[PDB]
Coordinates of C-alpha atoms in Angstrom, one line a residue:
Chain A
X1 CA 9.3 -19.8 -2.4
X2 CA 12.1 -21.8 -2.2
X3 CA 11.8 -24.9 -1.3
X4 CA 15.6 -26.6 -1.8
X5 CA 16.0 -30.6 -1.4
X6 CA 19.4 -32.0 -0.8
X7 CA 21.5 -35.5 -1.2
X8 CA 25.2 -36.3 -0.2
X9 CA 24.8 -40.1 -0.6
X10 CA 28.0 -40.4 -3.6
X11 CA 26.8 -40.6 -6.2
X12 CA 24.8 -37.7 -5.7
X13 CA 23.6 -36.8 -8.6
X14 CA 21.8 -39.8 -8.5
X15 CA 19.3 -37.4 -7.1
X16 CA 18.2 -36.1 -10.2
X17 CA 17.0 -39.8 -11.3
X18 CA 15.0 -39.9 -8.8
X19 CA 13.6 -36.1 -9.3
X20 CA 13.4 -36.5 -13.4
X21 CA 14.7 -33.3 -14.0
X22 CA 18.6 -33.5 -15.3
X23 CA 20.4 -31.5 -13.1
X24 CA 22.3 -29.9 -16.2
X25 CA 18.5 -28.4 -17.9
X26 CA 16.3 -25.9 -15.7
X27 CA 13.3 -25.8 -16.7
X28 CA 10.2 -23.2 -15.7
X29 CA 6.4 -24.8 -15.5
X30 CA 3.6 -22.2 -15.8
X31 CA 1.3 -22.5 -13.3
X32 CA -2.0 -20.4 -11.8
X33 CA -0.5 -16.6 -11.4
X34 CA 2.5 -17.4 -12.2
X35 CA 5.4 -19.8 -12.8
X36 CA 7.7 -22.5 -11.1
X37 CA 11.8 -23.1 -12.5
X38 CA 13.7 -26.0 -11.3
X39 CA 17.8 -26.2 -11.5
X40 CA 20.3 -27.2 -9.6
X41 CA 23.0 -24.8 -7.9
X42 CA 24.5 -27.8 -7.2
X43 CA 25.2 -31.8 -8.9
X44 CA 28.4 -33.2 -7.7
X45 CA 29.3 -36.9 -7.1
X46 CA 29.3 -35.8 -3.3
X47 CA 27.2 -32.7 -3.0
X48 CA 23.3 -32.1 -4.8
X49 CA 20.9 -30.1 -4.1
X50 CA 17.6 -29.6 -6.5
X51 CA 15.4 -26.0 -6.1
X52 CA 12.3 -25.0 -6.8
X53 CA 11.6 -21.0 -7.4
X54 CA 8.2 -19.9 -7.7
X55 CA 7.7 -17.0 -9.6
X56 CA 4.2 -15.5 -8.5
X57 CA 2.5 -12.2 -10.8
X58 CA 1.5 -10.3 -8.9
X59 CA -1.1 -8.3 -11.0
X60 CA -2.9 -11.2 -11.8
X61 CA -5.6 -11.2 -10.1
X73 CA -8.2 -2.5 0.0
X74 CA -4.9 -1.6 -1.1
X75 CA -3.4 -4.6 0.2
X76 CA -5.1 -6.8 -2.3
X77 CA -2.6 -5.6 -5.0
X78 CA 0.2 -5.0 -2.5
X79 CA 0.9 -8.9 -0.3
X80 CA 3.2 -10.9 1.1
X81 CA 1.6 -13.9 -2.0
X82 CA 4.1 -13.7 -4.5
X83 CA 7.3 -14.9 -1.9
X84 CA 5.7 -16.8 1.0
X85 CA 5.6 -20.9 0.3
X86 CA 2.0 -20.7 0.2
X87 CA -0.3 -23.2 -1.6
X88 CA 0.4 -22.5 -4.9
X89 CA 4.5 -24.6 -3.8
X90 CA 2.8 -27.7 -3.1
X91 CA 1.0 -27.0 -7.2
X92 CA 3.9 -26.7 -8.3
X93 CA 5.8 -29.6 -6.2
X94 CA 3.5 -31.9 -7.7
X95 CA 3.5 -30.1 -11.7
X96 CA 8.1 -30.3 -11.1
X97 CA 8.3 -33.5 -9.3
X98 CA 4.8 -35.5 -10.8
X99 CA 6.0 -38.9 -11.5
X100 CA 8.5 -38.6 -8.6
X101 CA 5.3 -38.4 -5.8
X102 CA 3.8 -42.1 -7.1
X103 CA 6.9 -43.7 -5.9
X104 CA 7.8 -44.4 -9.8
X105 CA 11.6 -44.5 -10.2
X106 CA 13.6 -46.2 -13.4
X107 CA 17.2 -45.8 -13.4
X108 CA 17.2 -46.4 -9.4
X109 CA 14.1 -48.3 -9.0
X110 CA 15.5 -49.1 -4.8
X111 CA 17.7 -45.6 -4.4
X112 CA 13.7 -45.0 -4.7
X113 CA 12.2 -48.0 -3.1
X114 CA 14.3 -47.3 0.9
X115 CA 14.6 -44.7 3.2
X116 CA 17.2 -42.0 1.7
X117 CA 19.1 -39.9 4.2
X118 CA 17.2 -36.6 2.6
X119 CA 17.9 -32.6 3.8
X120 CA 14.6 -30.0 2.5
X121 CA 14.2 -26.3 3.4
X122 CA 11.6 -24.6 3.1
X123 CA 10.9 -21.5 3.1
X124 CA 8.9 -17.9 4.8
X125 CA 6.2 -20.5 5.6
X126 CA 3.3 -18.1 7.5
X127 CA 2.5 -20.1 10.1
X128 CA -0.4 -17.7 12.4
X129 CA 0.7 -21.2 15.1
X130 CA 4.5 -20.2 15.0
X131 CA 7.0 -22.8 15.4
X132 CA 5.2 -25.5 18.2
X133 CA 2.6 -26.5 14.8
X134 CA 6.0 -26.9 12.8
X135 CA 6.9 -29.5 15.2
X136 CA 3.6 -31.0 15.5
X137 CA 3.4 -31.2 11.7
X138 CA 7.0 -32.5 11.0
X139 CA 8.4 -34.3 14.7
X140 CA 5.6 -37.3 14.0
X141 CA 6.5 -38.0 10.9
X142 CA 10.4 -38.5 11.6
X143 CA 12.1 -35.1 10.8
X144 CA 14.6 -33.6 12.7
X145 CA 12.6 -30.0 12.2
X146 CA 14.9 -26.9 12.5
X147 CA 12.9 -23.7 12.2
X148 CA 14.6 -19.8 12.0
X149 CA 12.2 -16.8 12.4
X150 CA 12.4 -13.4 11.1
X151 CA 12.1 -9.6 12.7
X152 CA 9.5 -7.8 10.2
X153 CA 12.1 -4.7 9.9
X154 CA 15.5 -4.8 11.8
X155 CA 15.8 -0.9 11.7
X156 CA 12.9 -1.0 13.8
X157 CA 12.6 -3.7 16.0
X158 CA 9.8 -1.9 18.4
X159 CA 7.2 -3.7 15.1
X160 CA 8.9 -7.4 16.6
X161 CA 8.3 -11.3 14.7
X162 CA 6.8 -12.0 11.8
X163 CA 4.9 -14.5 11.4
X164 CA 7.0 -16.5 8.5
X165 CA 9.2 -19.5 9.6
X166 CA 12.1 -21.2 7.2
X167 CA 11.8 -24.9 8.4
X168 CA 14.6 -26.9 7.9
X169 CA 14.4 -30.5 7.7
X170 CA 16.8 -33.9 8.0
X171 CA 15.2 -37.5 7.9
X172 CA 15.8 -40.6 6.2
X173 CA 12.7 -41.7 4.6
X174 CA 11.5 -42.1 0.4
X175 CA 11.9 -39.4 -1.3
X176 CA 7.7 -39.8 -1.8
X177 CA 7.6 -39.5 1.3
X178 CA 9.2 -36.2 1.9
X179 CA 7.8 -35.0 -1.3
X180 CA 4.5 -36.1 -0.3
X181 CA 4.9 -34.6 3.2
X182 CA 5.5 -31.4 2.4
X183 CA 2.9 -31.4 -0.9
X184 CA -0.3 -31.5 2.1
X185 CA 1.6 -29.9 5.2
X186 CA 2.1 -27.0 3.6
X187 CA -1.4 -25.9 2.7
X188 CA -2.9 -26.9 6.3
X189 CA -0.1 -24.1 7.8
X190 CA -1.3 -21.2 5.0
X191 CA -4.4 -19.8 7.5
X192 CA -5.3 -17.6 4.5
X193 CA -5.8 -19.9 1.5
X194 CA -9.3 -19.6 1.3
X195 CA -9.0 -16.0 0.6
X196 CA -7.1 -16.9 -2.7
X203 CA -5.4 -32.0 -5.1
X204 CA -7.4 -34.8 -3.6
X205 CA -6.0 -35.2 -0.6
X206 CA -5.3 -39.2 0.8
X207 CA -3.9 -40.6 -3.1
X208 CA -1.4 -38.1 -1.4
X209 CA -1.9 -39.2 2.7
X210 CA -1.4 -42.9 1.7
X211 CA 1.0 -44.6 4.6
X212 CA 1.7 -42.2 7.4
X213 CA -1.6 -39.9 7.1
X214 CA -4.1 -41.9 9.3
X215 CA -0.9 -42.8 12.2
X216 CA 0.2 -38.7 12.5
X217 CA -1.1 -37.2 15.3
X218 CA -2.3 -33.8 14.3
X219 CA -4.2 -36.4 11.1
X220 CA -7.6 -34.3 11.9
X221 CA -6.5 -31.2 12.4
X222 CA -4.7 -31.7 8.7
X223 CA -8.4 -33.1 7.4
Chain B
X9 CA -33.7 4.5 4.4
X10 CA -33.5 5.2 1.1
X11 CA -31.5 7.4 -1.7
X12 CA -31.3 10.8 -0.7
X13 CA -31.2 13.9 -2.7
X14 CA -28.4 16.8 -2.3
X15 CA -28.6 19.8 -4.2
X16 CA -25.3 22.1 -4.6
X17 CA -24.3 25.4 -6.2
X18 CA -21.7 23.4 -8.6
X19 CA -24.0 19.7 -8.8
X20 CA -28.2 20.2 -8.6
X21 CA -28.2 17.0 -8.3
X22 CA -26.1 14.0 -5.5
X23 CA -27.5 11.3 -5.5
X24 CA -26.2 9.1 -2.3
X25 CA -27.4 5.5 -2.9
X26 CA -29.1 3.4 0.5
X27 CA -26.4 1.2 1.3
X28 CA -23.7 3.8 0.9
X29 CA -26.3 5.2 3.0
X30 CA -25.7 2.3 5.4
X31 CA -22.2 2.5 5.7
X32 CA -21.1 6.1 6.0
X33 CA -24.1 6.0 9.2
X34 CA -21.3 3.0 11.0
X35 CA -18.7 5.0 10.6
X36 CA -19.9 8.9 11.6
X37 CA -21.9 7.0 14.1
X38 CA -19.4 4.8 15.9
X39 CA -16.1 6.9 15.9
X40 CA -16.2 10.5 14.6
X41 CA -15.6 13.5 16.6
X42 CA -18.9 16.4 18.1
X43 CA -21.0 16.8 14.9
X44 CA -21.0 20.6 15.8
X45 CA -17.3 20.8 14.0
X46 CA -18.0 19.5 11.1
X47 CA -18.4 21.4 8.3
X48 CA -16.0 20.5 6.2
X49 CA -14.9 16.9 4.9
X50 CA -12.2 17.1 1.8
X51 CA -13.0 15.4 -1.4
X52 CA -10.9 12.5 -2.2
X53 CA -8.4 13.6 -5.5
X54 CA -8.5 11.5 -8.7
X55 CA -4.8 10.5 -10.5
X56 CA -3.5 12.1 -13.5
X57 CA -3.4 9.7 -16.7
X58 CA -1.0 7.3 -17.5
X59 CA 2.6 7.8 -18.9
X60 CA 4.7 6.3 -21.8
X61 CA 7.5 7.5 -20.4
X62 CA 10.3 5.1 -19.7
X63 CA 10.0 3.2 -16.7
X64 CA 7.2 6.4 -15.4
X65 CA 3.8 4.9 -14.9
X66 CA 2.6 9.0 -14.0
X67 CA 4.0 12.1 -14.6
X68 CA 3.7 15.9 -14.4
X69 CA 3.3 15.7 -18.3
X70 CA -0.6 14.3 -18.3
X71 CA -1.5 16.7 -15.6
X72 CA -1.1 19.6 -17.1
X73 CA -2.8 18.6 -20.3
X74 CA -5.7 17.8 -18.4
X75 CA -5.8 21.8 -17.5
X76 CA -4.3 22.7 -21.1
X77 CA -7.0 20.6 -23.0
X78 CA -9.7 22.0 -21.3
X79 CA -9.0 25.7 -21.1
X80 CA -7.1 26.1 -18.5
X81 CA -3.7 27.8 -19.3
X82 CA -2.7 28.1 -15.8
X83 CA -1.3 25.5 -13.0
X84 CA -0.4 26.3 -9.7
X85 CA 1.9 23.0 -8.2
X86 CA 2.0 22.1 -4.7
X87 CA 4.3 19.8 -2.9
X88 CA 3.1 16.9 -1.9
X89 CA 4.8 16.5 1.8
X90 CA 4.0 12.6 3.6
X91 CA 1.5 12.5 5.9
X92 CA -2.0 12.6 6.7
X93 CA -4.6 15.3 5.1
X94 CA -6.1 17.1 8.2
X95 CA -8.9 19.6 8.9
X96 CA -8.3 22.1 11.2
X97 CA -10.1 24.7 12.8
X98 CA -9.8 26.7 15.3
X99 CA -12.1 29.3 17.6
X100 CA -10.4 32.1 19.9
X101 CA -11.9 31.4 22.7
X102 CA -14.3 28.7 24.0
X103 CA -16.6 31.3 24.2
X104 CA -16.4 31.6 20.3
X105 CA -17.5 27.6 19.5
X106 CA -19.8 27.7 21.8
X107 CA -21.2 30.8 20.0
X108 CA -20.6 30.3 16.5
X109 CA -20.4 26.2 16.5
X110 CA -22.8 25.2 18.4
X111 CA -19.7 23.4 20.2
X112 CA -20.1 22.8 24.0
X113 CA -17.7 20.4 25.4
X114 CA -15.8 24.0 26.0
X115 CA -13.4 23.2 23.3
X116 CA -12.1 26.0 21.1
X117 CA -10.6 23.8 18.6
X118 CA -10.2 20.6 16.8
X119 CA -8.7 18.2 13.9
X120 CA -10.3 16.3 11.7
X121 CA -9.5 13.6 9.4
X122 CA -11.0 12.7 6.0
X123 CA -13.3 9.8 8.2
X124 CA -14.9 12.9 10.4
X125 CA -12.6 11.5 13.8
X126 CA -9.6 13.3 16.2
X127 CA -7.3 12.4 14.3
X128 CA -5.5 12.9 18.2
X129 CA -6.6 10.2 20.5
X130 CA -4.6 11.8 23.0
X131 CA -7.1 15.1 23.4
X132 CA -4.1 17.1 25.0
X133 CA -1.8 17.0 22.1
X134 CA -5.2 18.1 19.3
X135 CA -5.9 21.0 21.7
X136 CA -1.6 21.4 22.5
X137 CA -1.2 21.7 18.2
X138 CA -4.6 23.9 18.1
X139 CA -3.5 26.9 20.2
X140 CA 0.3 26.5 19.0
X141 CA -2.0 27.8 15.6
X142 CA -3.7 30.8 17.6
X143 CA -0.6 32.4 18.9
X144 CA 1.0 32.4 15.6
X145 CA -2.3 34.0 13.6
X146 CA -2.5 36.4 16.7
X147 CA 0.9 37.5 15.5
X148 CA -0.5 39.0 12.7
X149 CA -3.4 39.8 12.7
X150 CA -5.8 36.8 11.5
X151 CA -8.3 37.9 13.4
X152 CA -8.1 41.8 12.6
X153 CA -7.3 41.3 8.4
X154 CA -10.2 39.1 8.2
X155 CA -12.8 40.2 10.7
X156 CA -13.3 37.0 12.2
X157 CA -13.5 35.0 15.2
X158 CA -12.4 31.1 14.0
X159 CA -10.6 29.7 10.7
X160 CA -11.4 26.3 8.6
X161 CA -8.0 25.3 6.9
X162 CA -6.9 22.4 4.4
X163 CA -3.9 20.8 5.6
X164 CA -1.4 18.2 5.9
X165 CA 0.0 17.0 9.1
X166 CA 2.9 14.5 9.2
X167 CA 4.2 12.2 10.5
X168 CA 1.1 9.4 9.3
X169 CA -1.4 9.3 11.9
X170 CA -0.4 6.4 14.3
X171 CA -3.3 4.2 13.5
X172 CA -1.6 5.0 9.5
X173 CA 1.9 3.9 10.9
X174 CA 0.6 0.3 12.2
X175 CA 0.1 -0.1 8.7
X176 CA 4.1 -0.3 8.8
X177 CA 3.3 -3.2 10.9
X178 CA 0.9 -5.3 10.1
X179 CA 1.9 -4.8 5.8
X180 CA 4.3 -3.0 4.2
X181 CA 7.1 -4.4 6.5
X182 CA 5.4 -8.0 6.0
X183 CA 5.9 -7.6 2.3
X184 CA 9.0 -6.4 3.1
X185 CA 10.7 -9.0 4.8
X186 CA 9.2 -12.2 3.0
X187 CA 10.2 -10.6 0.4
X188 CA 14.0 -9.5 0.9
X189 CA 15.1 -12.8 2.5
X190 CA 13.6 -15.5 -0.2
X191 CA 14.5 -13.0 -3.2
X192 CA 17.9 -12.6 -1.8
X193 CA 18.4 -16.1 -1.6
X194 CA 17.2 -16.9 -5.1
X195 CA 19.5 -14.6 -5.8
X196 CA 22.6 -16.8 -3.9
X197 CA 20.9 -20.3 -5.5
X198 CA 21.1 -18.4 -8.9
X199 CA 24.5 -18.0 -8.9
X200 CA 25.7 -20.4 -7.4
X201 CA 23.7 -22.7 -10.6
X202 CA 25.1 -20.2 -12.9
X203 CA 28.5 -21.8 -11.6
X204 CA 27.9 -24.7 -11.7
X205 CA 26.6 -25.0 -15.6
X217 CA 8.1 -27.7 -19.3
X218 CA 9.7 -25.6 -20.9
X219 CA 13.8 -25.5 -21.1
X220 CA 15.1 -21.7 -19.1
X221 CA 18.7 -20.4 -19.1
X222 CA 20.1 -20.0 -16.0
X223 CA 21.8 -16.2 -16.5
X224 CA 18.0 -15.3 -17.4
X225 CA 16.9 -16.0 -14.2
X226 CA 19.5 -14.4 -12.5
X227 CA 19.5 -11.1 -14.1
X228 CA 15.5 -10.7 -13.7
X229 CA 15.4 -11.8 -10.0
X230 CA 18.8 -9.9 -9.1
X231 CA 16.0 -7.1 -10.7
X232 CA 12.8 -8.1 -8.5
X233 CA 15.5 -7.8 -5.9
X234 CA 17.2 -5.3 -6.0
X235 CA 13.2 -3.6 -6.2
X236 CA 11.9 -5.2 -3.2
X237 CA 15.4 -3.3 -1.9
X238 CA 14.0 0.2 -3.2
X239 CA 10.4 -1.2 -1.2
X240 CA 11.9 -1.2 1.7
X241 CA 13.0 1.8 2.0
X242 CA 10.1 3.3 0.9
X243 CA 8.4 2.8 3.1
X244 CA 10.6 3.3 6.3
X245 CA 11.4 6.9 5.9
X246 CA 7.1 6.8 6.8
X247 CA 8.1 5.7 10.7
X248 CA 8.8 7.8 12.8
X249 CA 6.6 8.6 15.8
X250 CA 4.3 11.2 17.4
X251 CA 6.2 11.6 21.2
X252 CA 5.3 15.2 21.6
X253 CA 4.2 18.1 19.5
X254 CA 7.5 18.8 18.2
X255 CA 7.3 15.9 16.2
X256 CA 4.4 17.0 14.1
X257 CA 4.2 19.2 11.3
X258 CA 1.6 20.5 9.4
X259 CA 1.4 22.7 6.2
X260 CA -2.7 24.3 5.5
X261 CA -3.1 24.7 1.5
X262 CA -6.7 26.2 1.0
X263 CA -8.1 29.0 4.6
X264 CA -11.9 27.2 3.2
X265 CA -13.8 30.0 5.8
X266 CA -13.3 32.6 8.3
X267 CA -16.8 34.9 9.4
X268 CA -19.0 35.4 6.6
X269 CA -16.4 34.1 3.7
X270 CA -15.6 31.2 1.6
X271 CA -12.6 32.0 0.2
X272 CA -13.2 29.3 -3.4
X273 CA -13.2 32.1 -5.0
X274 CA -9.5 32.6 -4.5
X275 CA -7.2 31.7 -6.5
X276 CA -4.2 29.0 -5.4
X277 CA -1.9 31.8 -5.3
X278 CA -3.3 33.9 -2.7
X279 CA -4.2 30.5 -0.6
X280 CA 0.3 29.7 -0.4
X281 CA 0.6 33.1 0.0
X282 CA -2.1 34.4 2.6
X283 CA -0.9 31.2 4.5
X284 CA 2.2 31.9 4.8
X285 CA 2.4 34.9 5.7
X286 CA -0.1 34.3 9.1
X287 CA 0.3 30.9 9.5
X288 CA 3.5 29.5 8.9
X289 CA 5.9 32.6 10.5
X290 CA 7.9 32.6 13.7
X291 CA 7.4 29.1 14.0
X292 CA 8.5 25.8 12.5
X293 CA 5.4 23.7 13.2
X294 CA 3.5 25.4 10.4
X295 CA 5.0 25.3 7.1
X296 CA 4.7 27.5 3.3
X297 CA 4.6 24.6 1.3
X298 CA 7.3 24.6 -1.6
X299 CA 4.9 25.7 -4.9
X300 CA 5.6 26.8 -8.7
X301 CA 3.6 28.5 -11.1
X302 CA 3.1 26.9 -15.0
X303 CA 1.7 28.4 -17.6
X304 CA 0.6 24.4 -19.6
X305 CA 1.1 26.7 -22.5
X306 CA 4.8 26.9 -23.0
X307 CA 7.4 24.3 -23.6
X308 CA 9.6 26.6 -21.3
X309 CA 7.0 27.0 -18.1
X310 CA 6.5 22.8 -18.3
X311 CA 9.7 21.9 -18.5
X312 CA 10.8 24.0 -15.8
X313 CA 7.2 22.3 -13.6
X314 CA 9.5 18.8 -14.7
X315 CA 12.5 19.8 -13.6
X316 CA 10.7 20.5 -10.4
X317 CA 9.0 17.6 -9.7
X318 CA 12.1 15.4 -10.5
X319 CA 14.0 17.1 -8.2
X320 CA 11.2 16.8 -5.4
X321 CA 11.3 13.4 -5.7
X322 CA 14.9 12.7 -6.0
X323 CA 15.1 11.7 -2.1
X324 CA 11.7 11.2 -2.9
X325 CA 9.2 12.3 -2.1
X326 CA 5.7 11.1 -2.9
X327 CA 4.7 14.2 -5.4
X328 CA 3.2 16.9 -6.2
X329 CA -0.4 18.3 -6.3
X330 CA -1.2 20.1 -9.3
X331 CA -4.3 22.0 -9.3
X332 CA -5.8 25.3 -11.6
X333 CA -4.9 28.5 -10.7
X334 CA -8.4 29.6 -9.7
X335 CA -9.9 27.5 -7.0
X336 CA -13.1 26.7 -9.4
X337 CA -13.1 26.1 -12.3
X338 CA -15.1 25.2 -15.9
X339 CA -15.1 24.5 -19.1
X340 CA -17.4 26.2 -20.0
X341 CA -20.3 24.3 -17.6
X342 CA -18.5 21.8 -17.3
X343 CA -17.2 21.5 -13.8
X344 CA -13.5 20.4 -13.6
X345 CA -11.1 19.2 -11.3
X346 CA -9.9 21.2 -8.5
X347 CA -6.6 18.4 -8.3
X348 CA -4.9 15.7 -10.4
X349 CA -1.7 14.1 -8.1
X350 CA 1.5 13.3 -9.2
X351 CA 3.3 10.9 -7.3
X352 CA 6.4 10.0 -7.1
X353 CA 8.2 6.7 -8.7
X354 CA 9.6 5.2 -6.2
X355 CA 6.9 6.1 -3.9
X356 CA 4.2 4.5 -6.1
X357 CA 6.3 1.3 -4.4
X358 CA 3.8 1.8 -1.8
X359 CA 0.7 1.8 -3.8
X360 CA 0.8 -0.4 -7.0
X361 CA 3.6 -2.5 -5.1
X362 CA 7.7 -3.5 -4.8
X363 CA 7.7 -4.5 -8.1
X364 CA 5.3 -2.5 -9.7
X365 CA 8.0 -0.6 -12.2
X366 CA 9.4 -3.8 -13.7
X367 CA 8.3 -3.8 -17.5
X368 CA 6.5 -6.8 -17.4
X369 CA 4.7 -5.2 -15.8
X370 CA 4.2 -1.3 -15.5
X371 CA 3.2 -2.3 -18.4
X372 CA -0.2 -3.7 -17.7
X373 CA -0.8 -1.5 -15.5
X374 CA -0.7 1.4 -17.9
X375 CA -4.4 0.7 -18.5
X376 CA -6.2 1.7 -15.4
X377 CA -10.0 3.8 -15.3
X378 CA -10.2 6.6 -13.7
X379 CA -13.4 7.9 -14.7
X380 CA -14.9 7.2 -12.1
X381 CA -12.8 8.2 -9.1
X382 CA -12.5 11.8 -11.6
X383 CA -16.7 11.7 -10.9
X384 CA -16.4 10.6 -7.4
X385 CA -13.2 13.7 -6.9
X386 CA -16.3 16.1 -8.4
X387 CA -18.8 15.0 -6.4
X388 CA -17.2 15.6 -3.1
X389 CA -15.9 18.4 -3.8
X390 CA -19.0 20.5 -4.6
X391 CA -19.9 18.4 -1.8
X392 CA -17.5 20.1 0.7
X393 CA -17.9 23.3 -1.2
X394 CA -22.0 22.4 -0.3
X395 CA -21.4 22.2 3.7
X396 CA -19.6 25.0 3.8
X397 CA -21.8 28.2 1.5
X398 CA -24.5 26.6 4.4
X399 CA -22.4 26.9 8.0
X400 CA -21.5 30.1 6.6
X401 CA -24.8 31.1 5.4
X402 CA -26.1 30.2 9.4
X403 CA -28.0 27.0 8.2
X404 CA -28.9 24.5 10.9
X405 CA -27.2 21.6 11.4
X406 CA -29.4 19.0 9.7
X407 CA -28.4 21.3 5.9
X408 CA -24.6 21.1 6.6
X409 CA -24.6 17.5 8.2
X410 CA -26.2 16.4 5.0
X411 CA -23.6 17.2 2.2
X412 CA -20.7 16.7 5.2
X413 CA -22.3 13.2 5.5
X414 CA -22.8 12.8 1.1
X415 CA -18.5 13.4 1.2
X416 CA -19.0 9.9 3.2
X417 CA -21.2 8.0 2.4
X418 CA -20.0 8.2 -1.4
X419 CA -16.7 7.4 0.0
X420 CA -17.7 3.9 0.0
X421 CA -18.2 3.3 -2.9
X422 CA -16.1 0.9 -4.8
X423 CA -13.1 2.5 -6.1
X424 CA -10.0 1.3 -7.3
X425 CA -7.5 2.0 -4.2
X426 CA -4.5 2.5 -6.4
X427 CA -5.7 5.5 -7.8

């Protein structure tokens, strides 16, 4: 349910200009079935981190159609929030730093609680062709009860040098590919421009 | 088929629609016990009206009112234990079973679920529990005192069934791990931003809000964990009968619930720790201090907290004139209900919208099923043939495939 992005090229607060959310101005955006908060846990010249926080309403609607993991996972609602808070930043448009927006920046990202039926392997297959160094962490369903075994949640960390708009567009497209049951619960090629056609898993992504 | 019309002593006309009929045939024919044993299936039970006390969705006051305003001045409150519902039938021997039920596989007893299927996969475990119950009924003089070679019992069986305890893996813990991790990270992040500081948000409101969400999610996770412990042997089971339903020649739906409690304690719960007497009180719903006592009692049951209480009328079957009243109304524990209405149901903006719930359909379903099970007992005991008993039991199944709010 959380996306973080981190930039460390001093003046790191320049990350704010590329995203257009002034680090001193936390904001809330309203989605279908909830809302989304954007704020900067850290904004110094040496380190700047943005945070995208889903606030999904469980009541907005079997017993488990009321008791589900929806409000706590990086589902397709994450993509929808991305296109809503970092709207323009995905169009490469930056003003006060037009060239920062122009070149590959050294960047890090973290997507929490990605529900992937396909596990680690499908996460790499989607992200490493795009030039990311990818780190994946898994979770046990309940540490009290190891006998229940692994969850199919994964938290994905991305480290790479890329344009801010590619990063946002990568995550926007690739997240709902892992969300197998989005059908239970926005146009493509305008978002995959530059990278999608050449991606090894493009049939699978489409 | 078409529509099946069933006639019962309590409701002369009960309709089984084709699509409910089919949906039942599917689950009765494929995975169910010997249809000879199925002389009764338990009904679904309605909850109370919603409370308006702070932080409360269900509270004992409304269950009491249900009976008081319908002219029932005395209720019996029984503890709901952390377990499935199971029907227990015990014969003295396989000869009784064969002669009285028509059971042909030499089984001398059965423990089945509300769907008409064996509570256990291990059939040996079933029979071991049955004879343990039988030994007790010997060591009390049940058979003699009741002039019967068999008994049908309505019971709580703990812990959760093996099928039921899988949901903890497939569902409850999934929500639990995902919710704990992200909500803890949400708090950490907001906190950092708090110290380093669409529409405008306030970071400290946000932090407080996500702090509350995180807390509710911790409680949820502590609520479901309790229902985990596996049945490695018979010493892991706990069984608490709450009705003696039928013995040879009699259905005990004329007996009040104090009778049921007391009579089960004398005959089924003495000198074995496997079969317990259930904790209960009697409440005069007309007296503020009897009512207050039942509330306190209920606050204590759910302090841990347990699931709550089942509130029953003093007599087994009661009417308000000719209108049959609910034979039971559950009042579930505040913590327990996170397992039903979700982790964050107690949060303000949520519990508020949840307070408007429609129970009409569910009550109507509980009454029709209640009638059909009584008819099924009354037919067996008066020695009607299989199909006449079975149409009532199957009727219960069919109504259960009717769409209703799963949380109710």
